[PDB]
Amino acid sequence: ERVLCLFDVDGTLTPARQKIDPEVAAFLQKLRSRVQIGVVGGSDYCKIAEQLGDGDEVIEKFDYVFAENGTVQYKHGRLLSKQTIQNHLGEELLQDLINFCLSYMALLRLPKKRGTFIEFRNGMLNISPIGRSCTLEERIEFSELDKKEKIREKFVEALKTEFAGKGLRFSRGGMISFDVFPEGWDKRYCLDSLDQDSFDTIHFFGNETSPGGNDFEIFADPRTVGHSVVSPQDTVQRCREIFFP
Amino acid sequence: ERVLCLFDVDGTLTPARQKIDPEVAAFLQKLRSRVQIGVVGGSDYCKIAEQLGDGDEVIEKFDYVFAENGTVQYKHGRLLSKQTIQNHLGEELLQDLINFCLSYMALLRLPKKRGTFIEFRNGMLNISPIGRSCTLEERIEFSELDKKEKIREKFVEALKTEFAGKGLRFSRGGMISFDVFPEGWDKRYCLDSLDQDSFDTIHFFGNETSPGGNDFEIFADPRTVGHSVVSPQDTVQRCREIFFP
Ligand SMILES: [Mg+2]
Numbered sequence: 481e482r483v484l485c486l487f488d489v490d491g492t493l494t495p496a497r498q499k500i501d502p503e504v505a506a507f508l509q510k511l512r513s514r515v516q517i518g519v520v521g522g523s524d525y526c527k528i529a530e531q532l533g534d535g536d537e538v539i540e541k542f543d544y545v546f547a548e549n550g551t552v553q554y555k556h557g558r559l560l561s562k563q564t565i566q567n568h569l570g571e572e573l574l575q576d577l578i579n580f581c582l583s584y585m586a587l588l589r590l591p592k593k594r595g596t597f598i599e600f601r602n603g604m605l606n607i608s609p610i611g612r613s614c615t616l617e618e619r620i621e622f623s624e625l626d627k628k629e630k631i632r633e634k635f636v637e638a639l640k641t642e643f644a645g646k647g648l649r650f651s652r653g654g655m656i657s658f659d660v661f662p663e664g665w666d667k668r669y670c671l672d673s674l675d676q677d678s679f680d681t682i683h684f685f686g687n688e689t690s691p692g693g694n695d696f697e698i699f700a701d702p703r704t705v706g707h708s709v710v711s712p713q714d715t716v717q718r719c720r721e722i723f724f725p
Numbered sequence: 726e727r728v729l730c731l732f733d734v735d736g737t738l739t740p741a742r743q744k745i746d747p748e749v750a751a752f753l754q755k756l757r758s759r760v761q762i763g764v765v766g767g768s769d770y771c772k773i774a775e776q777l778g779d780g781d782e783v784i785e786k787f788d789y790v791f792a793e794n795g796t797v798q799y800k801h802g803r804l805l806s807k808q809t810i811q812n813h814l815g816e817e818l819l820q821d822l823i824n825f826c827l828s829y830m831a832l833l834r835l836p837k838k839r840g841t842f843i844e845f846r847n848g849m850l851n852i853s854p855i856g857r858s859c860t861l862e863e864r865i866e867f868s869e870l871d872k873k874e875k876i877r878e879k880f881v882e883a884l885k886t887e888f889a890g891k892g893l894r895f896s897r898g899g900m901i902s903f904d905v906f907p908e909g910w911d912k913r914y915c916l917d918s919l920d921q922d923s924f925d926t927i928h929f930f931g932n933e934t935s936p937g938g939n940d941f942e943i944f945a946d947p948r949t950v951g952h953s954v955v956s957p958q959d960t961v962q963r964c965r966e967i968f969f970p
């Protein structure tokens with residue numbers, strides 16, 4: 481009878497990278513009268529916050545906010561400390577990775593390069609051949625070339641082989657980047673903390689729950705009751721059926 | 726009888742990287758009753774702003790704010806547009822530079838690497854072997870090793886030779902980095918805009934006015950009356966002598 485509803489954000493609660501619909505937002509607060517609610521997203525906290533309210537409203541509107549897949553956690557309004565990727569991987573593998581990337585990207589010739597080719601986050605390294613400090617038009621330009629030349633895909637193939645057996649995973653970061661993260665630091669990461677919070681049931685809702693999707697692992701994990709949705713409206717209706725029948 | 730007093734910030738108006746003394750700040754506002762006043766600094770606007778007031782007070786307290794040596798300019802409260810380094814250098818030299826740096830740093834093995842090894846600014850590229858996303862203790866650790874191994878100094882020697890004749894200049898960026906900027910984009914850069922503003926006299930005040938110092942060029946430029954100071958109190962007294970005799 482302690483229940484948590486845990487939601488992916490993009491395509492589950494909001495249009496991708498955009499603000500939640502007030503009606504959906506209103507339902508979630510009602511749902512809170514029956515269960516605790518939480519969000520888990522790959523984006524950083526500032527982005528998620530911006531999609532789910534004004535200011536830091538989000539940490540008050542939700543019982544849990546898991547940013548960067550739960551490597552950053554807010555619990556009932558309070559920021560918890562997070563394990564760092566350097567602490568987890570150790571400095572030597574981390575620098576091996578970094579130097580391989582620097583070396584690989586040195587040899588890539590693009591139309592434009594900018595800066596912040598490697599962004600050190602909590603949950604991962606974000607790798608971007610063009611550089612994260614590019615403009616929107618520059619992103620589209622890179623994106624178009626990337627499809628033609630498989631720039632990010634070939635980079636990732638080289639990295640996976642190079643680091644075979646060493647516990648690194650890779651995922652697409654939009655148009656211009658990819659993430660490198662430790663094995664297990666997908667959305668499931670947040671389930672480890674949730675494990676200590678005495679929930680009787682954790683319901684997870686996501687829109688990418690098929691193999692390869694960024695919700696697959698947390699959806700399939702035996703610690704969650706999994707729910708597959710196709711839209712914020714679908715998520716609301718599913719919740720109505722389960723919790724307000 | 727249109728006069729501008731233009732001040733370096735660090736060691737000229739404030740302790741380096743710290744907040745201005747209220748008494749100095751008070752005098753500068755008085756000085757404004759006789760002349761226009763402006764600041765020019767290598768740091769970015771957010772840093773300079775933070776040293777010179779709360780919020781964006783600075784653009785109201787000074788007639789001109791030249792951040793990153795004037796590549797960013799506020800004039801009487803208004804942000805002016807700025808030429809970009811890519812526009813000035815062109816994409817091919819820019820990427821030649823970037824790829825040389827990526828390649829060089831790939832081969833450097835440090836105690837720790839983080840991220841943002843190349844930060845694209847308006848006025849320059851900031852190059853950091855450890856990565857700009859490191860903590861203060863990590864900066865000191867790098868700093869100590871850098872002195873032992875001449876990491877940044879050797880990097881810069883290699884860059885200068887490689888790009889000989891191509892109009893690039895280099896300067897120390899604290900403990901962990903160096904800047905790469907186009908020839909002429911030292912503090913003198915701000916004098917070009919000032920040239921169109923019909924000042925009868927521009928007085929420049931700086932604490933690094935000897936050859937090699939970051940105020941030397943603007944101090945020595947024939948467009949300024951140069952003043953060499955050793956402290957914020959010295960700057961105030963010099964101004965008193967000249968403008969309130
Ligand atoms: Mg989604």
Ligand SMILES: [Mg+2]
Pocket residue numbers: 698699700701702703704705706
């Ligand atoms: Mg499950």
Ligand SMILES: [Mg+2]
Pocket residue numbers: 733734735736737931932933
């Ligand atoms: Mg100074």
Ligand SMILES: [Mg+2]
Pocket residue numbers: 943944945946947948949950951
């Ligand atoms: Mg002069």
